[PDB]
Amino acid sequence: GWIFGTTLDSKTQSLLIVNNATNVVIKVCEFQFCNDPFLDVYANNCTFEYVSQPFLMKNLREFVFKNIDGYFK
Amino acid sequence: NYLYRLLRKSKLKPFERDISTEIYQAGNKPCNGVAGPNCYSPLQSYGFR
**Best CA proximity match to B14, nearest among A28, A47, A70:** A70
The separation between the first and the last C-alpha atoms of chain B, rounded to the nearest angstrom, is 13
Beta strands A14-19 and A71-72: pairing type? Answer: unpaired
How many helices (H) and strands (E) chain A has is answered by: 0, 6
What b/e string do you get for A31-69 counting C-beta neighbours within 10 Å, with b at 16 or more?
eeeeeeeeeeeeeeeeeeeeeeeeeeeeeeeeeeeeeee
Q: Which residues of A touch B (CB under 8 A)?
A: 10-13, 45, 69-70
Nearest CB among A12, A69, A70 relative to B20 is that of: A12
Experimental technique used to determine this entry: cryo-EM
CA B17 to chain CA centroid, Å, is 14
Cα end-to-end span (Å), chain A: 16
Nearest to B6 by CA among B24, B33, B20: B24
